[PDB]
Design a protein around this ligand. Structure first.
Ligand SMILES: C[C@H](CCC(=O)NCCC[N+](C)(C)C[C@H](O)CS(=O)(=O)O)[C@H]1CC[C@H]2[C@@H]3[C@H](O)C[C@@H]4C[C@H](O)CC[C@]4(C)[C@H]3C[C@H](O)[C@]12C
Ligand SMILES: [Mg+2]
Ligand SMILES: [Mg+2]
Ligand SMILES: [Zn+2]
Ligand SMILES: [Zn+2]
Lengths: 194, 336, 1358
DNA sequence: CTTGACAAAAGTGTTAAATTGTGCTATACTGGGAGCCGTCACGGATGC
DNA sequence: GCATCCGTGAGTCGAGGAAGCACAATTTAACACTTTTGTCAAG
């Protein structure tokens, strides 16, 4: 786990510090790990990036922390959710773990709002990771933003919703390998995390 | 499957000795040794030879001097009268007592040896080296002094274990005096390191060691104390690269080195053709191009029947001609 | 002479000593200060040779004149220092040590010969139990002791030294028993303690002596340092000593005459012994062993009455014989070695043969296994006791070096530590033995010595692995050196690193010819350096080679004439390009280098598919063949322009690809208009008149009078292709406009683009008539049409013209795709108007299902299935709507054109871009009820993106874990078929196989014709075994079937004239160690009969395993192939009828039974309740015919139907997996592998032979043995066909070198060594290991000895 | 073809330091310590 | 016949490199004196 720092560019070093490895002393073995440890569990939503992982023999074994996620004192990843009471979305943000998240109906960040009141009659939500359609009054929490599902590298890909996941994996990984240029210039289309 | 558990179980089958049992066994060994000395003096035999025969009989036929001479000496000892056969009986009882006294103190060596682990030798190696010291302790132990056996045996067991570590813990053996120097040097560095709050330099170590020690000697001693590194140590998380894959072989000549040696030999042979039949022979003998080894003016002189003085003149003349030919062609300067 | 065979055998202690140049007696390696090797150590110069050439240690001899001389001062031989790699030493073990290979390799060879279990062998070997070698009349618990009986430590001690026990009395109390009184078991000795055995009870340490003077019970106290010197009840005269002491002041004497009485014993010793009082001198002493009738004392008056150890007690002046036996029992390898020396192999074989007649099968199986080991030892000439080591060989020090690195640090191998431990323990054991140490110390040291030998030979096999102190890394032992993927075989013998090799990044070279590559100048300078130095010397660039080499060392010293010389050096030569992984033989191809400026290798576009190379950063290796043979082989056989067809299928492999297809498809596709589209006229002048008025388009389909034409076909009529293309140049018409052109005397109605394509083919082949016959003019040129063109050109013209045609197609495809205007925009992903309607229909049906589910008409499982079917149907409808929209409105859409032409994409990917993403699967395997209703053009939502990520990860992990299985499958196939080579023109066999043309479909229950690809993969390039008369055409026997013949046979089958075709196959070939030319067929890579000497076994393995990655993994896909090639029994196996007859179902509520009824027989099959029966009542089933759906067990089928049926089943079931994935593979390659699977037989009746019942041998050997037995009139050997997997078939091969280098190296070598096996170097792996010329290709004896000579020399010789 | 004269240069004999090897310690001590841990498949092996 | 255990196997390139002490026995570094080339004139 004590690794030579990857500092091709500032994003390379930022990514290396947010990487989560299932290997190392006391962990799995590269050839002794089955499909189960390498899959995207439903509780990875908001805590581990679903796309960013090394393609090859280490796929699913090395992962990245999602942008809004934070590790608590006991070591369990938490992700933020906006409290929704009475159909109005409040500014109270609650950081909560996967086991605590399973007890609530959590709406989606793209739910239309008329101010703070949920405007849509049909709300796309999750109940223990399953997508469902609910009414505004059945909603208890809301996603902070679409960015909390992905890592820092993946949040730097504009028009990500139009890309296949297999190619977005390559895009986020290759941003780490980009070399600094004497005439480097910021992208014309950005996402906001630059 | 566990050798340590198997050994501990085996030594647990011999009960520990009480004080009365310890004194009786120790007394019998001393009395037996004196009986052997008397038997050798009376019979005129070598005391070492008689002791081996007495030991061989006690240990029995289960142990691999051939057995025929053991029986012959045994019969000769038994042919002695009763007053002399008594010393043979005392010798036999003493040897049996020594075997039991060693067998009943195998727990002591294990207790001592468990404190020396991690210093280059495995636990069972420490035990067996400690057993060798225990055997020596039994030989030299004196029960007249009224000291317990564990008091005198602890000195020999620790000595045997410590010497074995000094002799067998390094692939490149370092003598005991030099090992003690390394151990003392390490202790002094450790004491200064915890007192200065940092790693001492060679000057602080040398000053604390005492007279006759300077920073150069400390560096040389530390250089000597460097263990070799294994050729099979992996590098990287992948287990497919080792140290041996990055160390070139610099003993055998390369294809380039072999080729230029043959090219030089071919060019030198062509250059020596211009020389006379005898002038070429002299230079190839004096430079070791024929027998491989350089000859001298006299040795070549005996070969041709000429004296020493003439040969150096013709060799100088022939060498001058080679310089002239090489100057006019410059076909031999690149190989230099 | 020449090495032809390699033999492996056991080494005796005598042979090991004969190898050694000296015994290694010290564990010292080198001096710590002078760094010179130490005398008698592991690096001794007196043993292994001088460090530097012709120089002794003392430096007295330093030249070659004293060659073969040994310096008297130091003892070092004056010779070459390289002998240090070859000269071995040895260690003389103090005690024998067993070889771990012949102990722990199950089943043990030592245990088999000695009839000891694995547990019993370990207990004896590692000093846990004794084994009896001479009982000496010993009795154990009332039962006599017998030989080979295992004794524990307690039992051995009781037999050898007797029974005794010490009972500690409490202080102060007095014993109730006297000294020397016999006691019995359970008798009380003191008031508080009771004895547990019967024997003499003796006072150990009397604490008080009570003497009775005569005048007086005076008492004396005894202390631990005082000892009593007199017996109990002894009359002591005044002055005689009573108690001895260290200090004479406290010594106790007797005042007057009296009797000494002993009291207060410290403990009581009860020993089972016999006490013999005596008066004179004794004839024995302490420690001797006596028998009944032996004299003891008094000159025969006292004699022993029982066996035991005798001890003399001078205090009690009696002789005690402790009852014991002089039993012979030993532990360790010294006991095992003695047993192995006493075996009579001839007598053991006779007893085993007699027991081979026992009725029990288990007894016969056990006797056969023992006899096989006995036969191996008898035939080889080895001795069983040689399996125990008395001398350990020591490896030459240069193979276990202690080298000084540049930094001054020393690096050493792990073998030195293993050798040092063995020497340290061996030397210590010698010292302990010389000191007469107790048995416990000696036993522990012997046990450690055995473990040190085990660790050196094979570390970690038994017990905890040995690690270097200060780390937890196990030491590398001799076994680890030779075994594994990183062992000697796979890392240094089967593959090596090579000189004259380079590597760089590859970029595409479109300007190259098919046989050319772009090699960087700087790589070429280094690769061809020795050739360049010679050329520089030849010209005036440098005076000699060494001066030339100095010039190239510095970059700024390289002049401009070096590059001209390098151009001259490489003229004509070729290099090998290689891209890893090398899945098939097209992964290495030879190219003629073209020196280019830059640092990247330029690769031809047409060879990318064979290399599986793209240009996103791949790298390739460059190799330079050196000699004329290596250049000739590469230029003739390995050249890229010569390998145009696939060896796996015979189809083109260098063919037009992505951009080339797109450019050629664009020009050969015609335009379709809609403006006019249907108007009818009366005269063509009216039709054109409407065109200038704008009423009808140029390519609108109209009817002039009665015929359907277009305005373009009427308006533009060209006299020749030149005029048509001149009009295109002026912009009069486009390439896609359909006009009328007069070509080859025919008034054609095509587009100028299609007429241009005809000229492209015509000029490339330089034949207008043949090129006209090769092309399909009236269609756009897609991937498949272009592939047919290349194949037909290869058949009619050859490699040279086809390579020219391929370059011409590449040039024009690249040119036209550039200027055509293919681009991808966001609006190119056209959303059909039907998608919105379909989704509304899906919502209403879904809402309808939910209402029904609320009403209770259906359960959860059927509701879930109905939802999935709805979305699967809707997904299919959208896919049709997506593509219908393209083919109607946007026929030139980039996504549609790429998919239609075969350039890129498939309908599934196009649907995701333009239709809907579809249904997705959970990580558990279930599909989400809600699909992804949005495409990539519209953009997925955050939740839909996360849902889709589960499948993306699962496929990514599936691919990663599939490469390992596919690559390991290929290695199995190579190792089982590496020795198969085409070795003769014809084997003369008359057997064959009948390839079916009709498949028994079950859904219709009738015979239906197979697919053309299936028949082509089974008949193309095969020799007819019998003459066939179909459709008036006589295909004679021995005729190679081309594609025309296959198509004729398919046509005849469609006419009901033929059902199957008899062909010669590798399955029925009778050639030993390979196949013949007439049984293989074509070299599919050349569409001509296979040349003798081809390694078809390697080609078969590479062909099967190359598409292994494309097989789905998720009893299906690659796992199905692996179990089929391994002949594994499926978990859900089907039920097959053992005998033929009528089926009788007895289905009942309790259980289900199937009865196969015949005239007299009735077999009962008890099927499970959930059995999907495929046979109903009133059916005549045959032997081996399935009764239940599932996979047939190959071994059950083999015993029920026969070898032919299982071979047909295996080939068909493997081909099913590849067909389902779209992979085209000939049946020859699978039949070659299956032929190796069915290579062995099992003996059932030995007959008049030495073979054993149940012995497994090769089918060729038993057949040769059978015909020999018949020749001299003897009973033949009855055998039974046997099927085994590729792994077992490869490991049971006759060559130990190939088997050892594959797997199970320890097991393969331990059996080969005992049998003394001799390897004849027949296949390919054995020759590669020894560096010999492989017996295939140009190294085959058929062509190897060919001589070439010109006419003038021939007459001079004649 | 040498013949004496000299001048280093390698060889030999003492000679002492310097290094290396070995024996010896006497109150009484008497059975070790880190292992701890996410695959799955086959073939085989006595055992029962 | 049947769990249970033991053993063996699981793609290729590349790039990463913790006593001291005394005393004896043995080896080694320095000189000092010969014996032997090497190199001169003399011929
Ligand atoms: C038919 C014509 C010869 C006319 C004649 O000699 N009379 C020959 C002579 C030279 C040939 C061209 C060049 O090779 C370059 C290029 C090679 C590609 O492979 C195919 C396209 C190109 C443009 C070729 C086309 C055609 O093949 C040409 C014009
Ligand atoms: Mg690539
Ligand atoms: Mg016209
Ligand atoms: Zn020498
Ligand atoms: Zn044949």
């Amino acid at each position: 786990l004590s690794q030579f720092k990857d500092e091709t560019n500032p994003l390379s070093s930022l990514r290396h510090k947010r990487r989560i490895s299932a290997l190392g002393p006391g962990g799995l073995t590269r050839e002794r790990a089955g499909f189960d440890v390498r899959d995207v569990h439903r509780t990875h939503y908001g805590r581990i990036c679903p796309v960013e992982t090394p393609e090859g023999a280490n796929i699913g074994l090395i992962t990245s922390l999602a942008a809004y996620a934070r590790v608590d004192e006991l070591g369990f990843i938490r992700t933020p959710y906006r409290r929704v009471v009475g159909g109005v979305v409040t500014d109270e943000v609650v950081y909560m773990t996967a086991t605590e998240e399973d007890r609530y109906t959590i709406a989606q960040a793209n739910t239309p709002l008329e101010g703070n009141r949920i405007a849509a009659e049909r709300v796309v939500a999750r109940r223990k990771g399953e997508p469902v359609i609910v009414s505004p009054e059945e909603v208890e929490f809301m996603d902070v933003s679409p960015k909390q599902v992905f890592s820092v590298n993946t949040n730097l890909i504009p028009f990500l919703e139009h890309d296949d996941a297999n190619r977005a994996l390559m895009g986020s990984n290759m941003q780490t390998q980009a070399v600094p240029l004497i005439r480097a210039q910021a992208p014309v289309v950005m996402t906001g995390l630059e | 499957s566990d050798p340590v558990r198997q050994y501990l179980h085996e030594i647990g089958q011999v009960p520990l000795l009480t004080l009365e049992e310890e004194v009786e066994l120790a007394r019998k060994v001393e009395e037996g040794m004196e009986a052997i000395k008397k038997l050798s003096e009376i019979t005129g035999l070598d005391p070492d030879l008689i002791r081996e025969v007495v030991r061989a009989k006690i240990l029995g036929s289960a142990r691999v001097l051939d057995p025929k001479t053991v029986e012959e000496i045994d019969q000769k000892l038994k042919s002695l009268p009763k007053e002399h056969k008594r010393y043979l009986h005392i010798a036999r009882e003493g040897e049996a007592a020594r075997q039991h006294l060693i067998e009943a103190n195998l727990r002591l060596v294990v207790s001592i040896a468990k404190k020396y682990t991690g210093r280059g030798l495995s636990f069972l190696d420490l035990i067996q080296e400690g057993n060798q010291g225990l055997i020596r302790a039994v030989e030299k132990f004196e029960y007249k002094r009224r000291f317990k056996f564990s008091t005198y045996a602890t000195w020999w067991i620790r000595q045997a274990i410590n010497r074995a570590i000094a002799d067998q813990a390094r692939t490149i053996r370092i003598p005991v005096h030099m090992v003690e120097t390394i151990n003392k040097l390490s202790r002094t560095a450790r004491q200064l390191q915890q007192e200065l709050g940092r790693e001492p330099t060679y000057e602080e170590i040398a000053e604390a060691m005492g007279p006759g020690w300077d920073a150069k000697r400390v560096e040389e001693t530390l250089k000597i104390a460097q263990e070799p590194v294994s050729l099979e140590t992996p590098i990287g998380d992948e287990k497919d690269s080792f140290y041996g894959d990055f160390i070139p072989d610099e003993h055998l000549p390369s294809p380039v080195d072999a080729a230029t040696q043959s090219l030089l030999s071919e060019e030198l042979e062509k250059a020596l053709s211009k020389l006379s039949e005898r002038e070429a022979m002299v230079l190839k003998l004096r430079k070791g191009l024929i027998d491989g080894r350089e000859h001298t003016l006299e040795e070549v002189g005996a070969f041709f029947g000429v004296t020493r003085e003439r040969i150096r003149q013709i060799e100088n003349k022939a060498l001058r001609k080679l310089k002239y030919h090489e100057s006019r062609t410059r076909k031999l300067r690149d190989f230099l | 002479k020449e090495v032809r065979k390699v033999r492996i055998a056991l080494a005796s202690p005598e042979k090991i000593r004969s190898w050694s140049y000296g015994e290694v007696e010290k564990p010292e390696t080198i001096n710590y200060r002078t760094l010179k090797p130490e005398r008698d150590g592991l690096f001794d110069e007196r043993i292994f040779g001088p460090i530097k050439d012709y120089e002794c240690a003392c430096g007295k001899y330093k030249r070659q004149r004293f060659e073969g001389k040994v310096c008297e001062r130091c003892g070092v031989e004056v010779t070459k220092s390289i002998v240090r790699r070859y000269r071995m030493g040895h260690i003389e073990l103090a005690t024998p040590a067993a070889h771990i290979w012949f102990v722990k390799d199950v089943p043990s060879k030592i245990g088999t010969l000695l009839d000891l279990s694995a547990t019993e062998l370990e207990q004896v070997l590692y000093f846990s139990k004794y084994i009896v070698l001479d009982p000496k009349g010993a009795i154990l618990n009332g039962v006599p002791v017998e030989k080979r009986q295992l004794l524990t430590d307690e039992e051995y001690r009781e037999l050898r030294y007797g029974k005794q026990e010490t009972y500690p009395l409490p202080p102060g109390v007095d014993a109730l028993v006297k000294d020397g009184e016999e006691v019995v078991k359970g008798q009380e000795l003191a008031p508080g303690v009771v004895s547990r055995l019967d024997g003499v009870a003796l006072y150990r340490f009397p604490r008080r002596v009570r003497v009775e003077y005569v005048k007086e019970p005076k008492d004396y106290r005894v202390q631990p340092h005082m000892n009593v010197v007199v017996p109990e009840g002894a009359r002591v005269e005044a002055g005689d000593k009573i108690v001895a002491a260290i200090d004479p002041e406290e010594e106790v004497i007797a005042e007057a005459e009296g009797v000494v009485h002993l009291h207060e014993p410290a403990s009581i010793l009860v020993v089972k012994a016999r006490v013999y009082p005596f008066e004179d001198d004794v004839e024995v002493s302490t420690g001797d062993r006596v028998a009944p009738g032996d004299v003891l004392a008094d000159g025969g008056k006292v004699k022993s009455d029982v066996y035991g150890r005798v001890e003399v007690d001078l205090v009690r002046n009696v002789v005690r014989v402790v009852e014991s036996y002089d039993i012979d029992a030993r532990m360790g390898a010294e006991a095992i070695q003695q047993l192995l020396k006493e075996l009579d192999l001839e007598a053991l074989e006779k007893e085993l043969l007699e027991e081979m007649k026992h009725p029990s099968r288990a007894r016969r199986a056990k006797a056969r296994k023992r006899l096989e080991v006995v036969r191996a030892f008898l035939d080889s000439g080895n001795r069983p006791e040689w399996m125990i080591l008395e001398a350990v060989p020591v490896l030459p020090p240069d193979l276990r070096p202690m080298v000084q690195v540049d930094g001054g640090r020393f690096a050493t191998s792990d073998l030195n530590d293993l050798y040092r431990r063995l020497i340290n323990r061996n030397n210590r054991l010698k010292k302990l033995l010389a000191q007469g140490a107790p048995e416990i110390i000696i036993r522990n040291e012997k046990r450690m010595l055995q473990e040190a030998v085990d660790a050196l030979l094979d570390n970690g096999r038994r017990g905890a692995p040995v690690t270097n102190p200060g780390s937890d890394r196990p030491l590398r032992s001799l076994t680890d050196i030779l075994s594994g993927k990183q062992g000697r075989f796979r890392q240094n013998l089967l593959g090596k690193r090579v000189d004259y090799s380079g590597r760089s990044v590859i970029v595409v070279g479109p300007q190259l010819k098919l046989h050319q590559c772009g090699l960087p100048k700087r790589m070429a300078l280094e690769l061809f350096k020795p050739f360049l130095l010679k050329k520089m010397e030849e010209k005036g660039i440098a005076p000699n080679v060494k001066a030339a080499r100095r010039m190239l060392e510095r970059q700024r010293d390289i002049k401009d004439e070096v590059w001209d010389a390098l151009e001259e050096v490489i003229h004509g030569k070729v290099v090998l390009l290689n891209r890893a992984p090398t899945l098939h033989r097209l992964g290495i191809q030879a190219f003629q280098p073209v020196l280019v400026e830059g640092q990247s290798i330029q690769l031809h576009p047409l060879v990318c598919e064979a290399f599986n190379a793209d240009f996103d950063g791949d790298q390739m290796a460059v190799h330079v063949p050196l000699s004329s043979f290596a250049q000739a082989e590469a230029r003739i056989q390995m050249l890229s322009a010569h390998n145009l067809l696939s060896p796996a299928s015979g189809e083109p492999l260098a063919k037009p690809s992505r951009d080339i297809i797109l450019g050629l498809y664009y020009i050969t596709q015609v335009r379709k208009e809609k403006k006019g589209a249907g108007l009818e006229f009366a005269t063509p002048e009216e039709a054109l008149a409407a065109h200038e008025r704008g009423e009808v388009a140029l390519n609108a389909p109209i009817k002039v009078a009665g015929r359907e034409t277009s305005v373009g076909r009427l308006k533009y009529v060209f006299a020749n292709p030149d005029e048509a293309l001149l009009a295109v140049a002026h912009g009069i018409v486009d390439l896609q406009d359909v006009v009328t052109v007069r070509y080859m005397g025919k008034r054609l109605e095509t587009s100028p683009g299609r007429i241009l394509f005809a000229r492209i083919v015509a000029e490339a082949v330089e034949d207008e008539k043949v090129a006209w016959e090769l092309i399909q003019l009236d269609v756009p040129q897609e991937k498949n049409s272009l592939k047919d063109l290349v194949y037909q050109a290869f058949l009619r013209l050859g490699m040279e013209k086809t390579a020219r045609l391929l370059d011409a197609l590449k040039y024009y495809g690249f040119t036209f795709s550039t200027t055509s205007g293919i681009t991808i925009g966001i609006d190119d992903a056209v959303i059909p108007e039907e998608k919105k309607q379909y989704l509304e229909e899906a919502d209403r049906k879904l809402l309808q299902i939910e209402q029904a589910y609320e009403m209770g008409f259906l359960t959860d499982r059927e509701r879930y299935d109905q939802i999935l079917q709805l979305w699967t149907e809707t997904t299919e409808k959208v896919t049709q709507a997506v593509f219908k929209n393209f083919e109607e409105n946007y026929p030139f859409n980039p996504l549609y054109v790429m998919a239609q032409s075969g350039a890129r994409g498939n309908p599934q990917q196009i649907r995701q871009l333009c239709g809907l993403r579809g249904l997705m699967q959970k990580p558990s395997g279930e599909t989400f009820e809600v699909p992804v209703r949005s495409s990539f053009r519209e953009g997925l939502t955050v939740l839909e993106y996360f849902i889709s990520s589960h499948g993306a990860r699962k496929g990514g992990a599936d691919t990663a874990l599939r490469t390992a299985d596919s690559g390991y499958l290929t290695r199995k196939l190579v190792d089982v078929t590496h020795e198969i080579v085409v070795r003769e023109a014809d084997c003369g066999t008359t057997n064959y196989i009948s390839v079916p043309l009709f498949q028994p479909d079950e859904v219709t229950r009738s015979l239906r014709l197979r697919k053309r690809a299936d028949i082509e993969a089974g008949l193309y390039g095969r020799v007819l075994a019998r003459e066939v008369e179909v459709l008036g055409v006589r295909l004679e026997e021995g005729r190679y079937l081309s594609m025309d013949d296959v198509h004729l046979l398919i046509k005849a089958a469609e006419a009901g004239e033929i059902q199957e075709v008899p062909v010669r196959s590798p399955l029925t070939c009778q050639t030993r160690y390979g196949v013949c030319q007439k049984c293989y067929g074509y070299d599919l890579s050349m569409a001509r009969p296979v040349s003798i000497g081809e390694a078809v076994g390697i080609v078969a393995a590479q062909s099967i395993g190359e598409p292994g990655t494309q097989l789905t993994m998720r009893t299906q896909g690659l796992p199905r192939v692996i179990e089929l090639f391994e002949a594994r029994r499926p978990k859900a196996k089907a039920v097959i009828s053992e005998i033929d007859g009528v089926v009788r179902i007895e289905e009942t509520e309790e259980k289900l039974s199937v009865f196969v009824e015949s005239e007299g027989f009735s077999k009962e099959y008890k099927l499970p309740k959930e059995a999907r029966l495929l046979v109903k009542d009133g059916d005549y089933v045959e032997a081996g015919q399935p009764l239940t759906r599932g996979a047939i067990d190959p071994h059950q089928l083999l015993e029920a139907k026969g070898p032919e049926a299982v071979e047909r089943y295996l080939v068909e079931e493997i081909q099913k997996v590849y067909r389902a994935q779209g992979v085209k593979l000939h049946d020859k390659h699978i039949e070659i592998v299956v032929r190796q699977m069915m290579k062995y037989v099992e003996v059932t009746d030995p007959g008049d032979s030495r073979l054993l019942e149940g012995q497994v041998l090769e089918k060729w050997d038993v057949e040769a043995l059978n015909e020999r037995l018949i020749a001299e009139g003897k009973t033949p050997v009855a055998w039974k066909p046997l099927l085994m997997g590729v792994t077992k078939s490869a490991l049971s091969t006759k060559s130990w070198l190939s088997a050892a280098s594959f797997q199970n190296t320890t097991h393969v070598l331990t059996e080969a060594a005992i049998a003394g096996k001799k390897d004849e170097l027949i296949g390919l792996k054995e020759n590669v290991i020894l560096g010999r010329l492989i017996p295939a290709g140009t190294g085959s004896d058929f062509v190897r000895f060919t001589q070439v000579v010109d006419q003038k020399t021939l007459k001079a010789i004649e």
